[PDB]
Write a protein that binds this DNA or RNA. Structure first.
Lengths: 605, 85
RNA sequence: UAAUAGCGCCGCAAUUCAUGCUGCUUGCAGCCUCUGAAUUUUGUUAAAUGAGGGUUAGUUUGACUGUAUAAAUACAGUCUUGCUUUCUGACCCUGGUAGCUGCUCACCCUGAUGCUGCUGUCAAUAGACAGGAUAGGUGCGCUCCCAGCAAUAAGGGCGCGGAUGUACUGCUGUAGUGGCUACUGAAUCACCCCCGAUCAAGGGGGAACCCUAAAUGGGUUGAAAGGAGAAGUCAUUUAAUAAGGC
DNA sequence: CGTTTAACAGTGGCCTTATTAAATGACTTCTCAACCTCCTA
DNA sequence: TAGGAGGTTCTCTTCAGTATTAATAAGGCCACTGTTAAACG
């Protein structure tokens, strides 16, 4: 999995774009809105929320009677498919971030029940804490998942108290019979995490997009002309009147690569037309850096044509493509203001012939497993047999190789690992360490990786404060000049990713190790709240202003973006990314060294 | 709101010679401003700095109407009929 | 006149180290000359930072083939398209005319993440004119400090009217400060100038340097990076509402 | 030789809180079809 | 034939969450009493 998106503007006539804008902003986005609303009020909805899997076909079932509707009719089939796919993905996400949140809440409740002090454990067990300690050592002799299973499995007060004592230290036997206030703060922190997860689980339903803003305009008339009767209704009117009038239709996900048919203009320019809309021809305006992808698209489609469809589109360097509208600055009709943009998702691994072989092996394994899975059932539907036929068709067609560039992949020395330490102040720090002999081959810092570019790092912090102030000075004036250094941060993290992967290449690394951070901006919020609740007992504003800057620094600390960028570059290059635990205490260099060493140690089994 | 308009609306919602600030007059002023602003909001859909003002005027008029309703329902009804709210 | 003091950032040092340098003694010895790392430690006659607003389908980072090269990388050949961003420059500006509209002010006191702070000329009014990014303070900035204003933070005081059943109002001139739309002023660029397109388009004319004796002969006249869409959530701030919310 | 002004140091009081919306910066999740059939030219 | 528009359907097996091992990094003024250390008749 090394999917990356390239983009290109699409240029055509004013009418060719009026057709698309009318056909999406007026018929496709309303279809997505109605599909979302219907998905919400479906009777099985609360069942889906219990799982993370919305059923495979439900969204299409609510769409089949919707295609013939008076206000949703007059669309290509592969665009009803776009709407179905968008809504299905929205609710495939929304049922996976609420199921895992519920799992976290359940686990945190179990841990809150787990947590007892030394005195509390003594009074519950009815024995001296020394017996608790001895039995806890005994049970540690007989990871944490096993202990939680043991606790949830037994009903004895003594054994369960032993589990509690063990997991209080984290499968450790610490004999420092002190710091009861520390336990009080820890229990307070766990309770705050419980409260925050509960506050999260009451989430808004997927909104959808209202381009017409009919509700806004109607509510303005209701609020001005009439008078509300209670506060709870005037508040709803106010909330509606302040909502954001979105003005961009949903994209068009074309999950089939061939739905975009490519051609060469009489001027040599590349051109696209999509399945269902062939009278609409769009001319590709890319940049030369992205030219080879589009030329590969045209060459691959022509190569499939010239073999009488003996070649499997499915090894195409194109996987799918969104067809979005950007936002333009100025005035005029929307088709003349917003720039149509094609976002093609390409499997970079397929560019080389050698990587194409890897992709071929992956697909030929997964799809023959699919064939075996369908061959056990005896239902033998007709379209099910059509699917079975297509699977063997892809099997047969996959062994016909297109002519692609050749690069002998990347032979990686398994010993030499790369450990990356992230931090609030040192965004990254890399240690190239050989595992056979623990001596680090090399160290680099945030000034070494950003060489000649290190000035950016300071300029990121110098102005992200400045912009943070400028926004504040413009909000009170209600000017739209709210700017932020998100692009600068993204550029800096991309530079770091390139530097780290280049360093791994130079020393012939066999892996890259990144820490598993977990919920990092939440644990610090909980800890700061717990500390401020004693530092400020009854003053909530004081509990908030306490460690404000530290918390906002954590929240804007983009560990996830940096990890994703490094993962993208390593996958593009072939470095096998692993994971480890960042040591809690230590210098960044030692942190990275021990991180990579631990990753190597755990990998061995 | 223009001074001439305020004087005219005070006189035309007047209860006597000197009643500026009577709940009827305050509701009349707020209603006049909101009625002028609704067209501006039909046209300029980006002027949020006026959106906050509109919300404030709506809430002020709502409070005034509730107060006058609790005090004197008769005056409340005749007022809400005069303004057609 | 004042910017004291604090905080953050750079540099300049000093020290100790190595991820450095040296040496083979190949993991040890020394050294801080470069490169860095960690402190503290000063703001030098200075080093490096540096935050008023804008302007290019700008340039470079590119693909394939072959060679040397294990590879990077270099060279040679063929192709080239303008996407989205980050810098570095260069250049322009410190806006006008109309409308629509928000807020805030009886009068005080304290004073906010409040506003203002450039050069010169004329005034020395409160404003024009020319210039202008060096723009109050410290090497550079701040929500910090100074200075003035402070109604547009919040709090307290407090006069007269109307209301006074819990809501609250007027003392208010476009007066100050904001927002929106429409037409307009300049840059519309990447060595310079001109004509042109900008859902498309480039064309031409010069300069300097190198090669070349010289030939618009040919070349050069700043660099980088890309995984996007959708949906939620967190945080900060702002504003309205509420007196809990259910 | 005792002493009385500067110079820090610890203490007590104050400080409101929630909901929706927006802007920004982040985070999390999901996705990243492929061959076939038919119907016109 | 050859383009162009529609059809179609499941994966994998499910089912993952709960631990720590610190320490960062805590208020900001306003006003007061209390100590404390150094210069001086």
């Amino acid at each position: 999995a090394s999917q990356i998106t390239i983009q290109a503007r699409l240029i055509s006539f004013e009418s060719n774009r009026q057709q698309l804008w009318k056909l999406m902003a007026d018929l496709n986005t309303p279809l997505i809105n109605e599909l979302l609303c219907q998905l919400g009020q479906h009777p099985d909805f609360e069942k889906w929320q219990q799982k993370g899997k919305l059923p495979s076909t439900v969204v299409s079932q609510l769409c089949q009677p919707l295609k013939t509707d008076p206000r949703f009719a007059g669309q290509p089939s592969r665009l009803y498919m776009s709407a179905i796919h968008i809504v299905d993905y929205i609710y495939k996400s929304w049922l996976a971030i609420q199921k895992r949140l519920q799992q976290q809440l359940d686990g945190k409740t179990r841990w809150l029940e787990m947590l007892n002090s030394d005195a509390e454990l003594v009074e519950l067990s009815g024995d001296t804490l020394e017996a608790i300690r001895v039995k806890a050592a005994e049970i540690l002799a007989i990871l944490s998942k096993t202990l939680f299973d043991a606790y949830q499995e037994t009903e004895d007060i003594k054994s369960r108290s032993a589990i509690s004592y063990l997991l209080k230290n984290g499968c450790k036997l610490t004999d420092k019979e002190e710091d009861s206030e520390k336990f009080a703060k820890r229990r307070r922190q766990v309770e705050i995490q419980i409260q925050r997860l509960t506050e999260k689980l009451i989430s808004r339903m997927p909104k959808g997009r209202d381009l017409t803003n009919a509700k806004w305009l109607e509510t303005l008339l209701t609020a001005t002309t009439t008078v509300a009767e209670d506060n709870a209704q005037a508040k709803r009117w106010q909330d509606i009147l302040l909502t954001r009038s979105s003005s961009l239709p949903f994209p068009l996900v074309f999950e089939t690569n061939e739905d975009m048919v490519w051609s060469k203009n009489q001027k040599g320019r590349l051109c696209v037309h999509f399945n269902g809309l062939s009278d609409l021809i769009f001319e590709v305006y890319c940049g030369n850096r992205q030219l080879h992808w589009f030329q590969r698209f045209l060459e691959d489609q022509q190569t499939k044509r010239k073999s009488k469809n003996q070649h499997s589109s499915g090894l195409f360097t194109l996987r799918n493509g969104h067809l979005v509208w950007l936002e333009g600055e100025g005035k005029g009709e929307p088709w003349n203001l917003h720039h149509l943009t094609l976002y093609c998702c390409v499997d970079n691994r397929l560019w080389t012939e050698e990587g194409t072989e890897i992709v071929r092996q992956e697909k030929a394994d997964e799809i023959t497993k699919f064939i075996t899975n369908m061959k056990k059932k005896s239902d033998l539907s007709d379209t099910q047999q059509a699917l079975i036929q297509r699977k063997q068709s892809t099997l047969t067609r996959i062994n016909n190789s297109f002519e692609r560039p050749s690069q002998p992949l990347y032979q990686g020395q398994s010993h030499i690992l790369v450990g990356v330490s992230l931090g609030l102040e040192k965004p990254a720090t890399v240690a190239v360490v050989d595992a056979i002999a623990n001596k680090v081959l090399a160290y680099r810092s945030i000034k070494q990786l950003l060489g000649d570019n290190y000035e950016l790092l300071n300029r990121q912090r110098r102005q992200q404060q400045y912009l943070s102030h400028e926004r504040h000075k413009a909000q009170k004036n209600f000017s739209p000049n709210q700017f932020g250094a998100s692009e600068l941060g993204q550029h800096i993290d991309r530079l770091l990713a390139k530097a780290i992967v280049a360093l791994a290449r130079t020393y012939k690394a066999g892996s890259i190790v990144l820490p598993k951070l977990g919920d990092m901006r939440e644990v610090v919020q909980s800890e700061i709240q717990a500390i401020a609740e004693q530092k400020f007992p009854g003053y909530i504003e004081g509990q908030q202003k306490y460690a404000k800057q530290y918390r906002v620094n954590v929240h804007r600390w983009s560990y996830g973006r940096l990890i994703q960028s490094i993962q993208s570059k390593a996958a593009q290059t072939g470095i096998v990314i692993e994971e480890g635990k960042q040591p809690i205490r230590g210098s960044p260099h030692d942190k990275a060294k021990e991180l990579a060493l631990s990753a190597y140690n755990l990998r061995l089994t | 709101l223009s001074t001439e308009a305020t004087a005219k609306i005070v006189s035309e919602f007047g209860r006597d010679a000197n009643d500026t600030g009577s709940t009827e007059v305050q509701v009349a002023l707020l209603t006049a401003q909101i009625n002028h602003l609704q067209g501006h909001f039909a046209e300029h859909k980006k002027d949020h700095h006026s959106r906050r003002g509109l919300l404030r005027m709506v809430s002020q008029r709502r409070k005034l109407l509730d107060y006058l309703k609790r005090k004197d329902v008769a005056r409340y009804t005749q007022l809400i009929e005069r303004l057609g709210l």
